[PDB]
Design a protein around this ligand. Structure first.
Ligand SMILES: *[C@@H]1O[C@H](CO)[C@@H](O[C@@H]2O[C@H](CO)[C@@H](O)[C@H](O)[C@H]2NC(C)=O)[C@H](O)[C@H]1NC(C)=O
Ligand SMILES: *[C@@H]1O[C@H](CO)[C@@H](O)[C@H](O)[C@H]1NC(C)=O
Ligand SMILES: *[C@H]1O[C@H](CO)[C@@H](O)[C@H](O)[C@H]1NC(C)=O
Ligand SMILES: *[C@H]1O[C@H](CO)[C@@H](O)[C@H](O)[C@H]1NC(C)=O
Ligand SMILES: [Cl-]
Ligand SMILES: [Cl-]
Lengths: 395, 18, 396
């Protein structure tokens, strides 16, 4: 009844494997999803043509989309995946919205992408945005009856990941009326650890921080010397994606400071994403790991949230394209497609995935704390389930 | 100081708080 | 050996909304005046200009239109882009112009970020004084007085943010030189706590550099006046680069019931603005522009604003550079060469000499307005700063 569908996909991600969402790491994930798809919600014969282009986590993403569309031989892709980097994504999202093209990303986590009344109307975020993490922190604070916090983060003025991360907390907290002291520095420059720690010493007892794990170990070390560990202060760091950083023993480096670090981290709690697994996830991981190693690269054991989300990005697109084609529209009705990807729950390769009424994936988080200081053992202490909006400590 | 001779990238977004 | 006639396509990206000083209808008369002036000679005889005027909407629209035009024209690109002026509108267009090797001239894009042209903003030539130019002038003003600290107080929209970018120009320069600055921002479109502003000023510095609407500044000055801050304890400065002709007559005057206090309050306020020169040519230029804009349904300053003057000169500068690149055996498509030709040079603009520095940014000349007679409330220019010379001098 319906002919084969030929969907042109433009994927804009970093070529540089330094990023957890580079083309090499994420491609396998999209391909895996594509197979699963091509074999059926879409008319048989349906095939996706995917172009993988370097976003350079910057201006190049824009240049590529435009060179592809405004070329004499150009045409608009039917689906845009990525960019992930906030400044690379903003321009692409604006264009996707202007051209009525659907855009899905496991990135663009900044608060500004929240307002979708105009410029970002065609963007659905499949991974938890920073404001979702901010909602979790608000629930954690309510649980403890905490009402004030010091936000201390590194702001490199370039990709600014930690600035955008704590912005998620700042937005939610201000909205709710909690007070926050703000302290930023560029970890890419010589650190004035004394000033950092003295500023904290004078502001708040609960400190929410975001900076590289080595920057955090340093702060914690100086705080240790100033006697701030061991009770007087509740420190938090945010490590949502990198498993080498939120894994047990985050204080260890095989350093001459390892002992001091273990003691200092007794006062540190780490926020990360609550991930889930199921039989299929294992296969997906195995298969993903296969392509990536065959592509000469050391893997990050199991795949991060970006790899997972981009696999689920494909599936969510297809579900929306189905219910839209049914209603009699075409793949060219980007606006229609995006609206279909919102306010729904579907099954991803890790478990249920729910997108909220504004086109943003609901996020679940966990808090990791040291439960045995002699050992330096860190375990999950509590979780927050975004959709239900409930924080709960574990038994 | 909401400044600091940085943030050249002040474009394509705004969010809140500097 | 006259070259073959040229067909130069220029894309003008400015706001349709006449609320802006650089709206299309306000600027078009000036561009047309300069084109009229160039065809009778530096370009090959028979050369024609096709100018498309497109709404930038002081936002994302500028980019959308640029892209849509190229795509519709199947990949054909304009030979010259004029504008945008709005900082957030201009950055994406500048990025694409650099990527496509197209020359982009603007009398706007005054923010500090556009200063770095190693890559992203290569291809952008700024024809009007950037905020950092006003910053250098403030540094000299400070060195003149031996002042080394200041409170920067400005309104920040989080939207167009004109005053934020203006004071960023000062902050950047002062930080380079080692002067201390206290920073205090507020959104003047929201409910103002005039007392919190003034209290922060009295707890921070004695030399205050502010930027906000003329009415917000008046409100702040009236409140500083009740706190006894306007009799010499503080030195206030406000920045009004584009519309400061009310002085001489009285920038404090509002035919209001606060008029007398405002006049007293303003005795401690100095206003920084652009030093604007005149010639009989400029005078005629203004009249024609003003007439065109008037029968178009708009009011207008008596001497066309800097954006309008700037864009007129942007065409003379483009033609100047294109003429040289052509004679050198290159084409209008060698945008980088055209851009480099517009840099590091002095030429004759509609109001006098115009010098573009080696980074492709026009040198700015500025004047300082102060109340010279407190009884009357008389405001005059007490000193100027000439950017190229880099010297500040109080007037005799
Ligand atoms: C994941 O996080 C780890 C930290 O646990 C990162 O590894 C560090 O990388 C920096 C910069 O290259 C080095 O200076 C550190 O010495 C590394 N630490 C360790 C223990 O390896 C790693 O770069 C991150 N992975 C990715 C791809 O983001
Ligand atoms: C979202 O969809 C759910 C069912 O999945 C429905 O209960 C709810 O009313 C919808 N939210 C709205 C009103 O946007
Ligand atoms: C510009 O501002 C002045 C006061 O600062 C005002 O008198 C004039 O009407 C305004 N005109 C413009 C620039 O539209
Ligand atoms: C302008 O500055 C350049 C450096 O960029 C210098 O080499 C040149 O001599 C100056 N102008 C000229 C060509 O006289
Ligand atoms: Cl990216
Ligand atoms: Cl504009």
């Amino acid at each position: 009844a319906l002919p084969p569908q030929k969907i042109e996909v433009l994927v804009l991600l970093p070529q540089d494997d330094s990023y957890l969402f580079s083309l090499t790491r994420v491609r396998p994930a999209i391909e895996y999803a594509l197979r699963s798809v091509e074999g059926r919600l879409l008319p048989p014969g349906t095939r996706f043509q995917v172009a993988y282009e370097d976003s350079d986590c910057g201006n190049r993403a824009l240049f590529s989309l435009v060179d592809r569309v405004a070329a004499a031989r150009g045409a608009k892709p039917d689906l845009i995946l990525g960019p992930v980097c906030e400044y690379a994504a903003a321009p692409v999202a604006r264009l996707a919205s202007h051209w009525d093209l659907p855009m899905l990303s496991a990135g663009a986590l900044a608060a500004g992408f929240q307002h979708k009344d105009s410029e970002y109307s065609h963007l659905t975020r499949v991974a938890p945005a920073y404001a979702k993490m901010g909602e979790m922190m608000l629930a954690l604070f309510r649980h403890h009856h905490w009402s004030r916090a010091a936000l201390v983060y590194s702001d490199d003025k370039l990709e600014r990941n930690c600035y955008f991360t704590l912005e998620g907390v700042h937005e939610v907290f201000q909205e709710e009326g909690l007070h926050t002291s703000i302290y930023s520095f560029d970890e890419t420059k010589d650190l004035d650890l004394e000033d950092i720690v003295r500023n904290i010493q004078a502001s708040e007892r609960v400190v929410i921080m975001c900076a590289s794990s080595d920057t955090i170990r340093s702060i914690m070390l100086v705080a240790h010397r100033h006697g701030m560990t061991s009770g007087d202060y509740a420190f938090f760091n945010i490590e949502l994606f990198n498993s080498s950083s939120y894994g047990d023993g985050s204080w260890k480096r095989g350093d001459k400071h390892d002992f001091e670090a273990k003691q200092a981290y007794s006062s540190l709690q780490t926020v990360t994403l609550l991930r889930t697994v199921k039989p299929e996830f294992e296969k997906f991981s195995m298969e993903v790991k296969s392509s990536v190693e065959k592509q000469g690269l050391n893997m990050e054991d199991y795949v991060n949230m970006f790899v997972e989300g981009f696999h689920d990005a494909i599936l969510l697109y297809v579900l929306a394209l189905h219910e839209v084609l049914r209603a009699g529209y075409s793949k060219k009705d980007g606006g229609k497609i995006i609206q279909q990807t919102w306010n729904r729950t579907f099954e991803g390769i890790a478990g249920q995935v729910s997108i909220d009424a504004n086109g943003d994936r609901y996020g679940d988080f966990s808090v990791i704390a040291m439960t045995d200081v002699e050992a330096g053992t860190q375990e999950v202490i509590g979780d927050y389930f975004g959709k239900e909006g409930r924080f709960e400590m574990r038994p | 100081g909401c400044f600091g001779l940085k943030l050249d990238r002040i474009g394509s977004m705004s969010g809140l708080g500097c």
